[PDB]
Structure formats: structure tokens, C-alpha cells
Amino acid sequence: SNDWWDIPYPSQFDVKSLKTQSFISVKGNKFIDDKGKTFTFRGVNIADTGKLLSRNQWQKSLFEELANNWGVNTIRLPIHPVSWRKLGPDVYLGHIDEAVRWANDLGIYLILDWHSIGYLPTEQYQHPMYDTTIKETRDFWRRITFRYQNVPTVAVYELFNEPTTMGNTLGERNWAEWKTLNESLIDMIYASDKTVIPLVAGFNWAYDLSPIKKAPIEREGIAYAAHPYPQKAKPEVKNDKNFFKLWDEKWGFAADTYPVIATELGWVQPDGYGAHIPVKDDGSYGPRIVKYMQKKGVSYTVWVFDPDWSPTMINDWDFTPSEQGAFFKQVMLEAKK
């Protein structure tokens, strides 16, 4: 332990431990499985692994509930940098391994999300739980890509959850700089595993993809994230037509050319639990965003399947559904059928 020269080199996840499972890949503007069928990610976020462990809720039964009773085919894991450091990489990766085995057994997929909020080029963030560096972010993806080489269960590497400069208080937002840094991460990933799908985000908290109309990331096999929460678009008159136009302008257009995953979406009533901008809505957003995504073939993972973090999909750890939880549960179950 004091003999640092005898610390072992890292090992890769044992692919023989898994049951057969299709790889998902990008083909044009769609995801497809390795049988050639169009595939749509449909599922939920759960909380950070460390948060779940802290209350003894990191267990296979959580994934079983979701796969069997909520219609999901995907779970997004929002890996918070502060938690990565607190558990440490070795321990955190040991718990991701569990998630891989649990998901594989149920035939569902994982999105691994490096869950920071802020501006990576200046290393300034919305809150210290998101604090990271370029060096730590690169090392996270280097470790992940090596460990989960050739693992179909781990489908998407979501490089940096929510880019934002908070009105340029964190730095001067610059698309060219952000594009170049994403390309750099993708190059490190693809040097280690070409079968994984990188997921890239725009500014305004992963809401604004409009820069990619003329400056998309110059790499193959990638998809784009979107976080179309209810109050991100602000039409004077609230109806389907006006939201659809604003969504089209900022993010929806991307689905015409590339696959898109709405890796966060959801709402709570303005006087409901943990209500805050931009997630406040009277509920009309639910049918509206689902209709929009269904029309464009957009994939999604609702935020969040947790009783503490808001907007919640459940009210307690017996999985009593919240308003949005009841709504999306029915949507996902119907889509699965």
C-alpha cells in the first residue's frame, strides 16, 4: 500500500459475465440495434450511486421495479464529480459494475452521465457538487472507456451533463472552444472503444443545440442531448404550436439529422414538492413534450426516479407515483407494449 510501485494496473469488466444483449449504434439520424431494428431509449434517471448507497437503496430491486413495472428500457446514471471523489474511482467503478450486471440481466441499457453543470473550459460551475477539471473529466472518460470496452449494456457516454456559463458569469461561452473540447474527449474514447455512443450537449443548460446547424461536432456515430424542461421556452401564448416552433428552433431540428436523447425532462406543479424554475408547469407540458418527441422519434430519460431530488417521479421508496411519475409510467408502459 505504501509500495506505490506495486499498485496494480487496472482491469476491464468481464464481458463473459453478461448474458447476450444487442449493441445499440447510430445510423444516420436514428439509433438501431444490432438486428437492424430502430431503437428508442425510453426510461428514467435515478440518483447518484453514492446518494442511493447512503440510504441502502442501491440495489437490483430498484432496476427490477423500473424494468418490470414502469416500462423502461434505459436508466441514466448521473455520476456527480463530488461523489466520484468521495467514493473514489475504484469503489465507484465497482458499483457501476453492479449496475451493468443488473441492467444486463433485465435486458435494459445504461447512459453514463458525467453530471456537472457549468463551463468546463474555465473549470467554473453552478455548485461545488459539480466541481471538476478538464484533467479529471478526461481521466473519468479514460477509465470508463477502458473498463467497459465491448459491453453492450453501457450504451451512451454523456460527456458533460449541462453546459452553461450562467449569463457569462462562469466564463465567456464560446461554441468553437466547446466543440473542440468535446472532439478531444471523443478522440480519447474512440481510441479505446469505437462501439460506444458519445452524447454531446449545447449551451443554456443543454437546451440550445442551434450552434450545430453550422458547426456540428466533426465526428461520426454521436448523438446530441437536450434538456427541454417546461420553462426553457417562453412563448407569450402557451399552446402546442408555439412551443413546437420554439423547440424546433433550439433543439428539435437536430433530430432531422442526428439521433437526440432528451436526457432530462419533467415537471412539478408550481406549488408542488421542490418546485423551481425551469420545471414548474400545470401539467399540460406532459402530453405536449411526449407528442413532440413521438413525432420526431426522440429518445428520453425523465428526471428523476427519486423521492428527494425534484422534480420527483415517486413520493417515497415504495414507488408511490407523483403526478409526472404516473403520467410517464403510463406513457412508457404503452410504448413498450
CA distance 111 to 240: 29
304 binds a second copy (CB under 8 A): no
Does 83 participate in binding a second copy (rule CB under 8 A)? Answer: yes
Alpha helices, DSSP H only, in 108-233?
134-147, 175-192, 203-206
Return the residue nearest Mg ion (CB atom): 154
In the set 17, 59, 180, 184, which binds a second copy (CB under 8 A)? 184
Site size toward a second copy, by CB under 8 A: 41
Nearest-approach distance from CB 318 to Mg ion, in angstroms: 33
Distances (CA, A) of 303 to 120, 147, 228, 243, 331: 23, 27, 11, 20, 15
Decide: helix, strand or coil at residue 101.
Answer: helix
| 3-state SS class at 156 | strand
26 marked among binding-site residues: no
CB of 11 to a second copy, least distance (A): 13
CB of 23 to Cl ion, least distance (A): 14
The DSSP secondary-structure symbol of 195 reads T
Shortest CA distance to 307 belongs to which of 272, 278, 277, 273? 273
User: Binding to Mg ion by residue 151, rule CB under 5 A?
Assistant: yes
One residue of 55, 276, 291, 295 binding Cl ion per CB under 5 A: 276
111 counts as binding Mg ion under rule CB under 5 A: no
* β partners of residue 186: none
By the 8 A CB rule, do 199 and 156 touch?
A: yes
Give CA separation, 146 vs 76, 140, 210, in Å: 20, 10, 32
Task: Figure out which of the listed residues 12, 17, 54, 59 binds a second copy, where binding follows CB under 8 A.
Answer: 54
Part in contact with a second copy (CB under 8 A); list of ranges 94-102, 165-173, 203-211, 237-245: 165-173
The site string for Mg ion over 154-183 (x = CB under 5 A, - otherwise) reads x-----------------------------
Of residues 71 and 307, the one with the C-beta less far from a second copy: 307
For the chain, the residue count is: 337
The residue among 159, 161, 207, 165 whose CA lies nearest residue 183 is 159
Q: Is 151 known to sit in a ligand binding site?
A: yes
Residue 295 touches which of Mg ion, a second copy, Cl ion, none (Cβ within 5-8 Å per kind):
none
The C-alpha atoms of residue 33 and residue 27 are separated, in whole angstroms, by 10
| Residues in touch with Mg ion (CB under 5 A) | 151, 154, 196
| Residues in touch with a second copy (CB under 8 A) | 2-5, 7, 9, 48, 50-51, 54, 80, 82-83, 86, 122-124, 127-129, 133, 135, 138-139, 142, 145-146, 165, 167-172, 184, 187-188, 191-192, 308-309
Pick out the residues of the known binding site for Mg(2+). 151, 154
